[PDB]
Amino acid sequence: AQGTLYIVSAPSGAGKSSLIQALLKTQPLYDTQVSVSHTTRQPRPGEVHGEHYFFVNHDEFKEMISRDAFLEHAEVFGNYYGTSREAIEQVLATGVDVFLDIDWQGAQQIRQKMPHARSIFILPPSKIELDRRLRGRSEEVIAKRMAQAVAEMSHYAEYDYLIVNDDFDTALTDLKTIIRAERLRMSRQKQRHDALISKLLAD
Amino acid sequence: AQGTLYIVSAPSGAGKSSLIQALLKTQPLYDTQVSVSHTTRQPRPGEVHGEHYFFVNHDEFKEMISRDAFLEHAEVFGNYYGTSREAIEQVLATGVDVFLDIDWQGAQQIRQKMPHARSIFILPPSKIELDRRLRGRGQDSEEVIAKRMAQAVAEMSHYAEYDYLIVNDDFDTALTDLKTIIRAERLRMSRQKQRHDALISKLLA
Amino acid sequence: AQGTLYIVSAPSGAGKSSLIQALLKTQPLYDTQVSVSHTTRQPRPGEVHGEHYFFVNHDEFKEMISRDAFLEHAEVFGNYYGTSREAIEQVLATGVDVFLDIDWQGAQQIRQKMPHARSIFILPPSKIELDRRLRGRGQDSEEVIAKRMAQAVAEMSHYAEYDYLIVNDDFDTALTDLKTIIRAERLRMSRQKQRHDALISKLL
Amino acid sequence: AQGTLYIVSAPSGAGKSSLIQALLKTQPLYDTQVSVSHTTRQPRPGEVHGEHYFFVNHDEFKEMISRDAFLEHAEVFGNYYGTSREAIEQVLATGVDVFLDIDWQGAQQIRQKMPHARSIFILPPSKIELDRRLRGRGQDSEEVIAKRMAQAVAEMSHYAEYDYLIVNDDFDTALTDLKTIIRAERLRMSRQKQRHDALISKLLA
Amino acid sequence: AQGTLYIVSAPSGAGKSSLIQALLKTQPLYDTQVSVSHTTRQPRPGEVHGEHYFFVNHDEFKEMISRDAFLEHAEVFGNYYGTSREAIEQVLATGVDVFLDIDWQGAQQIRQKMPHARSIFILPPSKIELDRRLRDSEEVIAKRMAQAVAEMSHYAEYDYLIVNDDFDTALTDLKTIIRAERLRMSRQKQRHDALISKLLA
């Protein structure tokens, strides 16, 4: 029962991170999972293969790049990161919804190799708030992060849904809503309620 | 800017009626509205022009039929009933969402003249429940029931023609599913881009 | 299948009235309805036969008393009020839940004639609040209040006779407790076995 | 001065597990706690006596069987498992509600030595969904599945023996149904009469 | 035995009207009522003295104006409308919360004589939305929009500010302000007198 793939993107300081987290805490694994990426970097203390990432050796990662195994990948200051098309494809095949957290670039790539995916973009409520959230806990470092954020936000129009994260809860509800709504699509419902519809039409 | 048009259909005994009602009680007029039909029949005690129907004289109704003013119409045992395409189009123009309650036939026609509209189909949770709900107050000839049940099955055959399917098992849950479809659509990019024009402007500098 | 009959009682000033009202505004007629009583009094402006009451003439009401047609009845300062047993029985038969608002006396009678009914009692959160609520618009003689307060204490004495007890401190919470009692009962095996006949069949 | 004991059972693939978990995350320990069984098997890495199980030696377990100390017990491929009538009686004695996750067999035993317990049965929404959930991660032999599916159908046969039936279609709704059953029971007269002793006193005076 | 008085103001097109309505539909009369105004106009079919309005004769209404009995009043195309200072004062005395819908001017006046008033200001989510909701001749609109901006200038004078983006959320914010106030110590100390007594004994 082909599940849906959600590409979620947002400039640092909108909650993209937290929201997806919160969403999964109220969703059974047979309903919603998060996408798991492949990486060549050493797992940190506490991490675990299969959950956080799919830790593979540098050569394995390359063997894959060659055979077009990744839906998207990129080398980030040292190591490689990638979204195995077979990994996300397998789970979606079991009727599970998958959430993929990526930047606008990877978004475009995935959205290209997979037109059925839905994409959600989260935005901060105002520039002051974006600023405040970014400053988190040098005026020079901030100015850079703020700029990187504006860059990211430029691609907002490329997405399917737009969530403005003013108040966290409301935002988490908007997210939950997008999911639920999609699950109410005819293709999906026709599948889920096969038995019921059969009975109803048959005398 | 442009609001969405929702075509809602369901066999008698699924709540199509009640659900739309309940939905509007929690929605301001600048957000959501039920469509209002044009009729030639005399208003009953308590009704009011503009709310329940658009009461017009037999000739006015005909003048409209001619100028293709109706999105759909039909003569039911005596009088004429119609959904003015103007009356809708205009309100969609003010950014309001419009709910149109119609049978599968009219659904197809509208879905034809306005291929932007979204359509929702409501279904009963089981045959026993559909039956129970249909039997209503519980005082009808086994003969009348058998007919209504048949008319319902006919209606349900077209379920696959719709965009969304809601299974009305528990009323509340169903009213939430409905509310959800609406809210979700309002989160579409085209819509959000419009609503938050000012914000996005500021953000991009 | 067979719906449940809820006998709801409470001393004036706990919200028994409002709560049942609020409950029905969020419930379709094929799941929960309120019980409609018979009365001989003239309908007031706005009322309507079939919804608020079953307005019958003084003689019709008596013809019924004789044939043990009422589940309970009583003559209140002038007119007669009654709960047609044929009426509540026909409705429960369609799987609808019926709410009957009555005093402790009528409660006992119905609970007698229909041991399958569930009963809920609503109480005020404190004596001060009961008092406050009773004083209503704050325009009554200290004498009238003292009487109403007494009538209330009388009523509350029978609380232990009921199945569920709801303490109406905050309205919403109370309306949720009510809703909860209903929903829970609907989750009983007998009920669920019926509702999901088809599903269980397929599963086994 | 008296809590309720909830026997919860369900075929693998309905969420019985998850639901009880979720329920406890929103319930203080003086309100709701889980049951703790007695077992003779060696504790696994990470387990701890008093929380997961009450690890006792093979002879201790037998000494109890004799003195009718268990509400129910059974020997499962090697070791003994049991629900101490007293261990529970203690907690229940502090006004805490206890949730006992067991199979239909154990259910019958407990339901026998404590006919004051309430029982809840959780069911999957359809056979396709039960199947889908059972297939889990999706990496098993069509042979293993066919077995687990059969074990599930067996389990579901005893559904009618229970007090409440929850159909786990949508997780949240199910978790609410569960929460509801609890809350409702807590509204019973015997319970409320206790909790609001002081208030009722004042009111009748 | 003391309720709060809520002064609610907002520029036309924020929902001030609808929100207060919606609030009362989920609130019992012994908790939160709305202010009943005095009027000289004839009651319409279905209305009733005491509930919708306080129907008084033209002279009675004047007798009051003179003795500064009204908190505010105005003559609208024919009749007089007023909010009796004594009518509110009586209901707050029964522990009921009262909602007063008024313009910024009347707000200032009430905010000056009456002990215990909280004020809430509702605002539209954006200018486009305010415009959309307001929308007639381009001439009439331009006027209503201007009257709105005037009104909004006094937002800072209020205690709470609600931004009505999505109706529901707004109705929740409103409900929240109320509930929160009811959790104030003075209030709670009263409501739970009996409980606290028992606890400390």
Place this chain on the structure above:
Amino acid sequence: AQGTLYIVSAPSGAGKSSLIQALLKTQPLYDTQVSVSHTTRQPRPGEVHGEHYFFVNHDEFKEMISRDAFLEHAEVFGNYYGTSREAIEQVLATGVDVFLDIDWQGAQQIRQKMPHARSIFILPPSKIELDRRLRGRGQDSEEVIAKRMAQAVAEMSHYAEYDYLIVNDDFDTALTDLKTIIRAERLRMSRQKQRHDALISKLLA
């Protein structure tokens, strides 16, 4: 942006602990955080400086006491514990709301150096329930209970000193009351005027 400081106090057995916990699980860090105290005691296994406490040496702690660096402090059987005026002040400066769990004494001190802070007091629903909750697992000498119950009554005497009073009858409702107090405060004009600077600007131009 300037955040609010919440002083939360309650007699043992009202849930003060649990409630604050539950509150933070549904609140992002850029909105709500908990207060980190300074202490002179040795960190236990698993603890970490910056998260659980601010572990400082006995002399450092004294150097602070002198310069009125603490909002409140007290020496508990051996070591010193304190709430740094600057630790809180810093975060509050980033627009985050801070929750401080303390006894009535420390409450008074903080409320005195920061008269802007809001204070919330949680109470048990009745004496029986307070008792029941205090008795905990139910394994304490009638002597130990009588003491804890007395310490609780002492604590509750200062309830009137607080801003908000929450009666923890049912956990959920209580957690909602708490959440409500927070939300409401965030709707204060000073706060809203800040958060919606941009919007108000546009609206008035």
